[PDB]
Design a protein around this ligand. Sequence first.
Ligand code: NA
Ligand code: NA
Lengths: 193, 193
Amino acid sequence: MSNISLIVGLGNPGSEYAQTRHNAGFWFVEQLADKYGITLKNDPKFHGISGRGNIEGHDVRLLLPMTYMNRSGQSVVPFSKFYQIAPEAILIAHDELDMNPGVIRLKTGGGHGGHNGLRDIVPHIGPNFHRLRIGIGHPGSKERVSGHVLGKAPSNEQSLMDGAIDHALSKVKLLVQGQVPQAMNQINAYKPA
Amino acid sequence: MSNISLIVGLGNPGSEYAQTRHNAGFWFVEQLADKYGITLKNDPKFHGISGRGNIEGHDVRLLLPMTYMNRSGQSVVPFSKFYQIAPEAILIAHDELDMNPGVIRLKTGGGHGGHNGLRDIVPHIGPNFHRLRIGIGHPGSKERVSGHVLGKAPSNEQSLMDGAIDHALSKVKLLVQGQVPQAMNQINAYKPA
Ligand code: NA
Ligand code: NA
């Protein structure tokens, strides 16, 4: 349909991970759900929390997998199949190590790029879904990635992330209406300062 | 049957969690398994990795749930019910915030103590299993706990935990033979040299 009809946010369940960087995706979809008054409810059939409502005159579904990050396909895949949502109609929001806090970008296609949530999704639905890449920064080395993704950010780049998040939220209208290239131009132009 | 016939280690699956404090139970069971040459294999029926073999003259089963910590009972409960293993024959090894690194204790009964793995187990099999509490230290405050349990210990604290674990490994013979009071005395007496 061009129109984005399913918005997924990646992350891990529970209060001990709610503030960690790896939950950037959840931050985006939870805020988007509040903004439009969409209720997120337990959806154990699809191993997630999900909702459905009107975003700018369109019927859109929202999904947070409760599988833990690296099993997110166990929710996304059956959900996408049951509602017959094609990949081109899916936006997946997720944390991105290779972009600094405050950077945010909309991408279409490509692989998983080392993201372990997307690694579990691409093999079963293919790559042609859209991705909202929320920068979280990269720590010094590979040895430190785990402590970085599963740690809470300092107030500073958590301020930066939130601003970028809020900006992407302001462009969701363009996505649900099928204007992806414009959404891309407008989201990708965001400058933290 | 005071003899221990099921030894469970608690933790989170994946290389990114393997060296974290919350996996202290997995460290104990993996090392136990290698000591006696018991192979741990994928056991998707029970949402974990399990093995079975002779420990010091007794046939013992070993289980690592692959559910993530807070869903441990989704492995332990059906596994123990399928093999008709009573709670009094189970030992569960886990990290304990309430004891320091290099402190290790054997406990029978009681509640979960705020441990979110045990919280998922005690409701279904009751409290009367044995616990090998492996001290990991408590950081300053309730808000530092997540980053502590999901963090890798510095090498001086790791060595203290490893010594305690090595000491418990040497007393497994007493547990599988049924001598729980002697094991409790000998384990709980441990002090780093
Ligand atoms: Na990458
Ligand atoms: Na406690």
